[PDB]
């Protein structure tokens, strides 16, 4: 059982990347609302389950003009899963128990700005003590190598000077070394096949998803497969126990 949360501005290719990680179309009938409906659109929660994986999406995030309670619907869901597990752990049927606690949250940073918006800082500072945050740079094929390194160094500095507790990798040797150096991962996703390979077609060249010299798709996928046991371990031993002690304040 693993639970992956997806948070980010609409239109960042989050659905495409998720369908690219496992080659599973999870949004066959999803409809995108018009710009008039996004004005007052609220944040909703959709959970898709495939096989022991659950992808928790948060459609509506950032679409509203006035983020009234943009984080509240997400924060309360994370706390709800901690509360349900808490009351099931304290129950008498601990044998048959479902662990829906969010083990990892992919947050999609826009590549079209200079760094990260205040919305990114507020959201991460709101959940970094509750979920393992893995920042990702959406639509990496819009950044040159020079532009890509400028954005990664800026995001990491802003993370440090805002004290963002993102998920950290632990300490074969070349795998861990190159994986840590590419954080934050700048990924490219695709459902198209193009002399045939998965990627995106432009008049001036073809981007390859599984090409590490083009984007960090393979690194993100490799990091998730290898650190999947550690992600849920930090969730159970750190984020859940902090919620449990904070719950006992009242």
Partner 1 sequence: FCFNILCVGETGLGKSTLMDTLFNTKFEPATHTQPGVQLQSNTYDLRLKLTIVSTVGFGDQINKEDSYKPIVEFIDAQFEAYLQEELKIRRVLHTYHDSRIHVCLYFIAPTGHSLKSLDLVTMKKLDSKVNIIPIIAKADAISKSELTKFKIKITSELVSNGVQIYQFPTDDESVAEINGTMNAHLPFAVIGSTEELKIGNKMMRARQYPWGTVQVENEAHCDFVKLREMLIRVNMEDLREQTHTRHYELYRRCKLEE
Ligand X SMILES: Nc1nc2c(ncn2[C@@H]2O[C@H](COP(=O)(O)OP(=O)(O)OP(=O)(O)O)[C@@H](O)[C@H]2O)c(=O)[nH]1
Please, are residues 135 and 223 in contact by the beta-carbon 8 Å criterion?
no
Q: Strand 46-50 vs strand 104-109: parallel, antiparallel, or unpaired?
A: unpaired
Binder among 16, 81, 232, 235 for ligand GDP (CB under 6 A): 16
The span from the CA of 85 to the CA of 79, in Å, is: 10
Residue 15 interacting partner from ligand GDP, partner 1, ligand X, none (CB closer than 5 to 8 Å by kind): ligand GDP
Does 89 help bind ligand X (rule: CB under 6 A)? Answer: no
Q: What is the DSSP string of 75-138?
A: HHHHHHHHHHHHHHHSSS--SS-------EEEEEE-SSSSS--HHHHHHHHHHTTTS-EEEEES
Q: Nearest approach, Cβ of 63 to partner 1 (angstroms)?
A: 6
Residue among 86 and 121 whose Cβ is closer to ligand X = 121
Q: Nearest approach, Cβ of 212 to ligand GDP (angstroms)?
A: 15
Residue 14 interacting partner from partner 1, ligand X, ligand GDP, none (CB closer than 5 to 8 Å by kind): ligand GDP
Residue among 172 and 202 whose Cβ is closer to partner 1 = 202
Could you count the other beta carbons within 10 Å of the beta carbon of residue 53?
16
Binder among 48, 73, 142, 222 for ligand X (CB under 6 A): 142
The span from the CA of 170 to the CA of 186, in Å, is: 20
* Binding track, positions 150-189, relative to partner 1; x by CB under 8 A: ----------------------------------------
Asked if residue 34 belongs to a known ligand binding site, the reply is no
Does 12 help bind ligand GDP (rule: CB under 6 A)? Answer: yes
Does 142 help bind ligand GDP (rule: CB under 6 A)? Answer: yes
Please return the burial class of 249, using the count of CB atoms within 10 Å of its CB with bins 0-12, 13-18 and 19+.
Answer: exposed
The span from the CA of 151 to the CA of 170, in Å, is: 24
Is residue 205 classed as helix, strand or coil in its secondary structure? strand
Binding residues are 8-15, 42, 60, 139-147, 189, 200
**Binding footprint of ligand X on the chain (CB under 6 A):** 142, 147
**Binding footprint of ligand GDP on the chain (CB under 6 A):** 10-16, 139, 141-142, 188-189
Binding residues for GTP are 8-15, 42, 60, 139-147, 189, 200
């Amino acid at each position: 059982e693993f639970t992956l949360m997806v948070v980010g501005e609409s239109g960042l290719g989050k659905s495409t990347l998720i369908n690219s990680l496992f080659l599973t179309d999870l949004y066959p009938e999803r409809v995108i609302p018009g710009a008039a409906e996004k004005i007052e659109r609220t944040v909703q929660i959709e959970a898709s389950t495939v096989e022991r994986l659950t992808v928790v999406d948060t459609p509506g995030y950032g679409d509203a003009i006035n983020c009234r309670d943009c984080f509240k619907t997400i924060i309360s869901y994370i706390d709800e899963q901690f509360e349900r597990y808490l009351h099931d752990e304290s129950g008498l049927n601990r044998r048959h128990i479902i662990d829906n606690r969010v083990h990892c949250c992919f947050y999609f940073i826009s590549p079209f700005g200079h760094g990260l918006k205040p919305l990114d800082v507020a959201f991460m500072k709101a959940i970094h003590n509750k979920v393992n945050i893995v920042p990702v740079i959406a639509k990496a094929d819009t950044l040159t190598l020079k532009e890509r390194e400028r954005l990664k160094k800026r995001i990491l500095d802003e993370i440090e000077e805002h004290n963002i507790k993102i998920y950290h990798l632990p300490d074969f040797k070349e795998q861990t070394r190159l994986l840590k150096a590419s954080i934050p991962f700048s990924v490219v996703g695709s459902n198209q096949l193009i002399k045939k390979v998965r990627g995106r077609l432009y008049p001036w060249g073809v981007v390859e998803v599984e090409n590490p010299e083009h984007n960090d798709f393979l690194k993100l996928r490799t990091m998730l497969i290898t650190h999947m046991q550690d992600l849920q371990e930090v969730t159970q031993d750190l984020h859940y126990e902090n919620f449990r002690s904070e719950r006992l304040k009242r």
